[PDB]
Amino acid sequence: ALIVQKFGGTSVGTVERIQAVAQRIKRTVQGGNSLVVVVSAMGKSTDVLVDLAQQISPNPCRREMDMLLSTGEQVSIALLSLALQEIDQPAISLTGAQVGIVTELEIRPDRLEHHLREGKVVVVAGFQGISEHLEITTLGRGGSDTSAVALAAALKADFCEIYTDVPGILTTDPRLVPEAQLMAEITCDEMLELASLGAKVLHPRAVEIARNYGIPLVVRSSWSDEPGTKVVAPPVRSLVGLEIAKAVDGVEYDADQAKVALLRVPDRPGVASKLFRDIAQQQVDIDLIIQSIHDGNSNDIAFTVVKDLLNTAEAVTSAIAPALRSYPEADQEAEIIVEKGIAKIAIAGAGMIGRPGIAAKMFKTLADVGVNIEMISTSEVKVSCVIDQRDADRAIAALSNAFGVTLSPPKNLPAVRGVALDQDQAQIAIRHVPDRPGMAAQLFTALAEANISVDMIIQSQRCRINQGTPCRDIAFMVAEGDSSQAEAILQPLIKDWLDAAIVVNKAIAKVSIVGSGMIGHPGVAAHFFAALAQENINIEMIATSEIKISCVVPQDRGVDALKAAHSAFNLAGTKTVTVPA
């Protein structure tokens, strides 16, 4: 019944189109539904507005600017509601304080449209803002999506539909893999980790709000009546006080963790494949998998398991190891170590995507409370850290306070839902970071103060040092554009770290698989790694969350690796054929 629909610019770019949506809305109502409609400004209309302002002053006072940009939807909802009224659909345009209030940023809807709900389709645009004071403003770039979800939440809508010039979410980038299939369903969490698959179609903060208030979502197309892609949430009631610019949505803590690491394994295709294949044959489910930058002609591989599986996991690992040695008698190779007294902590949040200083503030918070960071693993929306279990209590209190959030559960359908590829990034590693509190904080604070956002951070074992104090290598990734400046920022800071060094490698690609089904499902990572080895593709780095695995890989092989992952998990799906005679 109660459905919130939103329509983007293009869907409304011409008067003709406006009449079409109006048609669908009517049809929807006549289905037995009540409709709240959010509309974006018409099209390049917004672009022309900003153009104009730019020829008047370089820096536009923000309020005068929010008023200017606010006129767009003001007209779009006027047009649409007229169009509805022409075809005898009772409608009405609500604006500003009639719909809600933004405070600065904190949004809160009301219900003069709960009223107007009787007969009419309520078409909405704008909230009232306070600081001077503005009568109508928008929430910004991705405001349309967010407003819609926030509204569905406030009204207890049955679901929320986002209409666009796209049938839904694909399994990957069609431009590289034509066999990319249209997803019927995807989880909020998956959608967040695969943000890029929704780049120009919907905004991560809105799918996160939907997840948090149990609002069913649907990415559909306007030029079609196809089902589209359902964005699915946990079944979750009334909450009103929405922070819309939070970098971090939640903090996480899992004490049921134990580390197995294989040290100094050969750095060649097939190694990781074999390791995890054998482990999965024991039906051993895995959590973290961390592999940072190579050390000479070899690397380490670390993973975590539930505490009571550590013994099993160590024994199995200890037995594969000799099969991993370049040559039988290489006792210096494939050496195994084990660590039982660890905890995993994380910060999670859609608001960290593309935003600087988030990881850095996590590290500072821990450093300020004296807790050393042992390992580090990023996904799209999580930064995970492994710490001494004894530090856990003060560590997550600190993170809880610093980020203003409550705790999500420690741990919460197919193994893989979609796969993705990033080839615009540069790897930068800082060799030999002293393994003591505050080091990562100081390196990543520096980058963040220069407005450089970081995409990946990977930190694994202590360096095999001849002598000096313990230290670890830290690898991270940034846009190739930021490569040079990043190096230039960090070089000073390591000047007097024994044997420290900065090395950049531009020729890398990142291949990722995402899937909620991989939790408590042994052999997912193994299948992924095997897929890359069968193509003789070397895995330079690995980083994980519970539902995302990323492998760093040679740039000249990113596409090949994407296709392999796509096929390994069957993203193209299955066609069928007339077998004759």
Ligand X SMILES: N[C@@H](CCCC[NH3+])C(=O)O
Ligand Y SMILES: C[C@@H](O)[C@H](N)C(=O)O
In the complex, the residues that contact a copy of itself under the rule CB under 8 A are 15, 18-19, 49, 52-53, 55-57, 60-61, 63-65, 67-68, 70-72, 74-75, 77-79, 81-83, 85-86, 92-93, 95-98, 112, 126, 132-136
H/E element, 18: helix 15-29
Q: Which partner, ligand Y, a copy of itself, ligand X, none, binds residue 453 by CB below 5 to 8 Å per kind?
A: ligand X
Residue 426 CB, nearest approach to ligand X (Å): 14
Contact call for residue 356 and ligand X (CB under 6 A):
yes
Residue 182, classified by CB atoms within 10 Å of its CB into exposed (0-12), middle (13-18) or buried (19+), is: middle
Contact 69, 101 (CB under 8 A): no
- Choose from a copy of itself, ligand X, ligand Y, none: what does 546 bind? Cβ within 5-8 Å by kind: ligand X
Report the residue number, 127 or 528, with the smaller CB distance to ligand X: 528
DSSP states of 132-144 as a string?
Answer: -EEEEE---TTHH
Spatial contact of 272 and 331, defined as CB atoms under 8 Å apart: no
Nearest approach, Cβ of 412 to ligand X (angstroms)? 12
Which residue, chain included where needed, has tokens 């809305």? Answer: 25
92 binds, among ligand Y, a copy of itself, ligand X, none (CB under 5 to 8 A by kind): a copy of itself
Q: CA-to-CA distance for 353 and 383, rounded, in angstroms?
A: 11
462: β partners: 472
Task: Map the footprint of ligand X across residues 383-402, applying CB under 6 A.
Answer: 383
- Asked if residue 166 binds ligand X (CB under 6 A), the reply is no
Comparing CB distances to a copy of itself, the nearer of 96 and 418 is: 96
Binding of ligand X at residue 549 (CB under 6 A)?
yes
Pick from 268, 294, 325, 355: which binds ligand X (CB under 6 A)?
355
Residue 60 Cβ vs a copy of itself, minimum distance, rounded to whole Å: 6
Answer yes or no: are the C-beta atoms of 79 and 73 closer than 8 Å: no
- The entry of ligand Y, a copy of itself, ligand X, none near residue 355 (CB within 5 to 8 angstroms by kind) is ligand X
- Beta carbon of residue 372, minimum distance to ligand Y (angstroms, whole number): 5
Per partner kind, with CB cut-offs from 5 to 8 A, the member of a copy of itself, ligand X, ligand Y, none near residue 383 is: ligand X
Q: How far is the CB of 32 from ligand X (least distance, A)?
A: 43
From the list a copy of itself, ligand Y, ligand X, none, partner contacted by residue 272 (C-beta under 5 to 8 A by kind): ligand Y
Q: Which one of ligand X, ligand Y, a copy of itself, none interacts with residue 524, CB within 5 to 8 A by kind? A: ligand X
The long-range contacts involving 447-450, CB below 8 angstroms and separated by at least 24 positions, are: 447/356, 447/360, 447/478, 447/486, 447/489, 447/490, 448/356, 448/357, 448/358, 448/359, 448/360, 448/361, 449/357, 450/485, 450/489
Q: Which of the stretches 43-51, 357-365, 423-431, 530-538 binds ligand X when contact is defined by CB under 6 A?
A: 357-365
Q: How far is the CB of 115 from a copy of itself (least distance, A)?
A: 11
DSSP letters for 20-35:
HHHHHHHHHHTTT-EE
Binding partner selected for residue 440 from a copy of itself, ligand X, ligand Y, none, CB under the kind-specific 5 to 8 Å limit: ligand Y
What whole-number distance in Å separates Cα of residue 373 and Cα of residue 363?
8
* Interacting residue with ligand X among 126, 546, 552, 563 (CB under 6 A): 546
- Could you tell me the CA-to-CA distances from 334 to 264, 271, 299, 319, 323 in Å, in that order? 5, 10, 9, 10, 9
Give the x-and-dash track for 410-449 against ligand X (CB under 6 A): --------------------------------------x-
Closer Cβ to ligand X, 294 or 521, answer by number: 521
Question: Token digits for 275?
Answer: 């390791």
Backbone angles phi and psi of 8, in degrees to 5: -80, 180
**Of 260, 426, 471, 518, which one interacts with ligand X (CB under 6 A)?**
518
- The rounded distance, in Å, linking the Cα atoms of 238 and 250 is 19
Q: How far is the CB of 61 from ligand X (least distance, A)?
A: 26
Dist. CA 430–CA 404, nearest whole Å: 31
Cβ(133)–Cβ(101) below 8 Å: no
What beta strand segments (E) does 268-353 contain?
A: 289-290, 298-305, 335-348
How far is it between the farthest Cα atoms of the chain? 84
* Distance in angstroms (rounded) separating the CA atoms of residues 446 and 486: 9
Per-residue binding string, ligand X, 469-508, x by CB under 6 A, is ----------------------------------------
Q: Binding ligand X by CB under 6 A: which of 208, 267, 380, 473?
A: 380
H or E stretch at 387? strand 382-388
Among a copy of itself, ligand X, ligand Y, none, partner that 359 touches (CB below 5 to 8 angstroms by kind): ligand X
With a CB cutoff of 8 Å and minimum separation 6, the contacts of 528 are: 513, 549, 551, 565, 568, 569
* 106: partner contacted, choices ligand X, ligand Y, a copy of itself, none (Cβ within 5-8 A by kind): none
Q: Is 250 in the site for ligand X (CB under 6 A)?
A: no
Residue 1 vs 15, nearer CB to a copy of itself: 15
CB 267 within 8 A of CB 298: yes
Cβ 141 to a copy of itself shortest distance, Å? 17
Interacting residues with ligand Y (CB under 6 A): 265, 267-273, 291, 299, 301, 367, 372-373, 433, 435-441, 459, 472, 474, 538-539
- 553 φ, ψ to 5°? -155, 160
Give min distance, CB of 22 to a copy of itself, in A: 8
Q: How far is the CB of 137 from ligand X (least distance, A)?
A: 26
Say how many residues touch ligand X, by CB under 6 A: 31
Question: Cα separation of 212 and 214, whole Å?
Answer: 6
Terminal C-alpha separation, the chain: 51
Sites of contact with ligand X (CB under 6 A) = 285-287, 289, 352, 355-360, 378-380, 383, 448, 453-456, 518-519, 521-526, 544, 546, 549
